[PDB]
Symmetry: C2
Subunit: 214 residues, 2 copies
Amino acid sequence: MDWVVAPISVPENGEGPFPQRLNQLKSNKDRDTKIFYSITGPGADSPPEGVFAVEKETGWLLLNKPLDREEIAKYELFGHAVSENGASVEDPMNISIIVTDQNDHKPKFTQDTFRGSVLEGVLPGTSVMQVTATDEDDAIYTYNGVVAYSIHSQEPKDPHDLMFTIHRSTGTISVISSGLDREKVPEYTLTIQATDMDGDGSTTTAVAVVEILD
Amino acid sequence: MDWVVAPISVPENGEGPFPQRLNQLKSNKDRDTKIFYSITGPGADSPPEGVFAVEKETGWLLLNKPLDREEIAKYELFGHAVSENGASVEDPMNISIIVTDQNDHKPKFTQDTFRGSVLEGVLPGTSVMQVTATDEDDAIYTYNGVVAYSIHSQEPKDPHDLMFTIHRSTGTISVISSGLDREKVPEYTLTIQATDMDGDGSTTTAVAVVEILD
Ligand SMILES: [Ca+2]
Ligand SMILES: [Ca+2]
Ligand SMILES: [Ca+2]
Ligand SMILES: [Ca+2]
Ligand SMILES: [Ca+2]
Ligand SMILES: [Ca+2]
Ligand SMILES: [Ca+2]
Ligand SMILES: [Ca+2]
Ligand SMILES: [Ca+2]
Ligand SMILES: [Ca+2]
Ligand SMILES: [Ca+2]
Ligand SMILES: [Ca+2]
Ligand SMILES: [Ca+2]
Ligand SMILES: [Ca+2]
């Protein structure tokens, strides 16, 4: 052809229909004799078996089911070409398959509860703590794995509500009001959120507990 | 995003419509201020100017016309992000565009006429000469640039016709008949052909003149 194929990029979670054609393998010895094609490697003849196949007669490389980037992100397979008289007519061909991302993981907070303390007299603008959520999707080329933080809600609501903020990118929680008074309200429970696609995607929650120190 | 884009592969001779969107550039400083996008490089702001553009407000990278791999096979552009107050908010982003092939060149013989001579007594199977045609299209991953040779016709047709063959891949012309006789027919003119897609594509012609030596 030459007996080569460029790396193939396949987005995960393809709709099909399956089996899906990716590339047609072909040995120029098929002018001379009938060629039988086959494939080996993890994803073909070793676990996960049968994700990919090749059609014996035609050389079509097929994907049999949708892929999942977070299970396996890249496959390295080998294609074979054998004459009808049983002789290999090519050295095995390196077939590289790269699985590209879709946004299919929700963020996950690293803790169900995060705790931080401040002195009663801290001024507005004071950083209390930094929370974190991870996201298994790509955050280099897209926002699939990019988390935006927000505050869902605060209890109690004394001396008033929305006394805290969270930095949309860093997860740093700050107090933005005056009026902390430990003798009145010694602790606040914040329900916090993390949302992928930098705020447009899906959202998980955790708790941040703010202790007013004595 | 990060302020990066993976290389973009675009087949030549795209149907459009144009302008065609390729990728949306985006700086995360647009949470903070309005961003104006722009592009530089050969193919954008230097020859060939205006092949690619970027939409100021949206950051969409556009292709303005179909590409031709044999004119330019790869572009290296730079994307820019500038705040409404005039400050650059990113270092320029490397944008790599790779133009991939379609079969749009016919083969071209290297000579309009090729000449070879043989002794009258050469046996069937004798190689007379080797002709060549080139093809500017890809011959690594496809047959776009892969030439199949054939004989179009022979004059004169004495002592009979189809006295010669040509090797489909090498362009080696051979005599396959007995009966060469210089005193009867001292020279044969062969119209020869070269066809891309290894025989399925389009076809050019040349002349091969076979001299029977004394
Ligand atoms: Ca997945
Ligand atoms: Ca995994
Ligand atoms: Ca994913
Ligand atoms: Ca995600
Ligand atoms: Ca005080
Ligand atoms: Ca006090
Ligand atoms: Ca005290
Ligand atoms: Ca072209
Ligand atoms: Ca050129
Ligand atoms: Ca071409
Ligand atoms: Ca061609
Ligand atoms: Ca003789
Ligand atoms: Ca003789
Ligand atoms: Ca003589």
